[PDB]
Structure 1
Amino acid sequence: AFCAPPAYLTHQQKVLRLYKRALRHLESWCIHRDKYRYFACLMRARFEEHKNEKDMMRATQLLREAEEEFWQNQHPQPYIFPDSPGGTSFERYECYKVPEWCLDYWHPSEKAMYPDYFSKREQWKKLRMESWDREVKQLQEETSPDGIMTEALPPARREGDLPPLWWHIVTRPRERPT
């Protein structure tokens, strides 16, 4: 979720991302660990061979017949983790992840309690406004010459500056507000 999506996918990342779906869809059919740790080191063998094929055409012909072998030999209900998209707890706790710009409309009574909390919150909001200028300028001074532009954003590159556009990757609702 953090890093940005590459435009096109390479040959490798397509092969190496099957090694994941495949092995992980082999642990649904083969549940017991032993059977798995066996039937899987046999899987790598399949990928291990045909590793050094230099003939791209061939390589993309082993890959395209691998992902069809796989599609027809996949488990309908694989083991997808509890908290991952498609899971059982996906986005469960999101009903408690309020977006933090809402503590700004609190009644002076509410914010009266919890006081040191807002003393540190006002510091961070000073940090945010104190750099928007140096940030956007950075984002621009270092904007790429006309051409390929990806969603990757630059690091700081100078002391005191804060990574450009950092207010919502930091200050992001806690994963499990519990």
Structure 2
Amino acid sequence: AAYFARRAAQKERVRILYRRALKDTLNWAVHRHIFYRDASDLREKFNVNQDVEDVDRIDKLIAHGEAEYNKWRHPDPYIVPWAPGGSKFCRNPTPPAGIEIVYNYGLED
């Protein structure tokens, strides 16, 4: 094949799913002294295979990883309050850049 487009997708999904797993680990681990061990467990789990070369042995792995990850979601994940979904999104947004208001409208002659 010699096409890195497929593997670049793999190197993209692995980082995306690792970031999402770390976020969810932070959410589940309300206290952090357990979050260290849990994060270590997640990082070690991602290094279990760490050697995939065949294209036939990645699609099943990514499907299994996605299915297992989606099984626990922490229905209330962390969103920054000003983030798109937070507790103060569009709190007092900056006014639109260009808008003008005419004064004398409805006059005659």
* TM-score (norm. length: structure 2): 0.75
Task: Find the counterpart in structure 1 of residue 98 from structure 2.
Answer: 101
Task: Find the counterpart in structure 2 of residue 92 from structure 1.
Answer: 91
Task: Find the counterpart in structure 2 of residue 53 from structure 1.
Answer: 52
Name which structure has the greater RCO, CA cutoff 8 Å, separation 6+. Answer: 1
Query: Which consecutive unaligned segments of at least 5 residues does structure 1 have?
Result: 1-8, 108-178
Cα distance, 1:66 vs. partner? 0.7
Task: Find the counterpart in structure 2 of residue 64 from structure 1.
Answer: 63
Cα distance, 1:57 vs. partner? 2.1
* TM-score (norm. length: structure 1): 0.48
CA RMSD of aligned residues (A): 2.0
Query: Which consecutive unaligned segments of at least 5 residues does structure 2 have?
Result: 1-7, 104-109
Output the CA distance in 1 between the equivalents of 2:41 and 2:96. Answer: 47
Output the CA distance in 2 between the equivalents of 1:32 and 1:12. Answer: 31
Cα distance, 1:77 vs. partner? 0.8
Aligned AA (2:97): E
Three-state SS of the structure 2 residue aligned to 1:54 is coil
Task: Find the counterpart in structure 1 of residue 81 from structure 2.
Answer: 82
Residues 48, 106 of structure 1: CA spacing in aligned structure 2 closer, same or farther, 3 A cutoff?
Answer: farther
Output the CA distance in 2 between the equivalents of 1:66 and 1:86. Answer: 26
Aligned residue pairs total 96
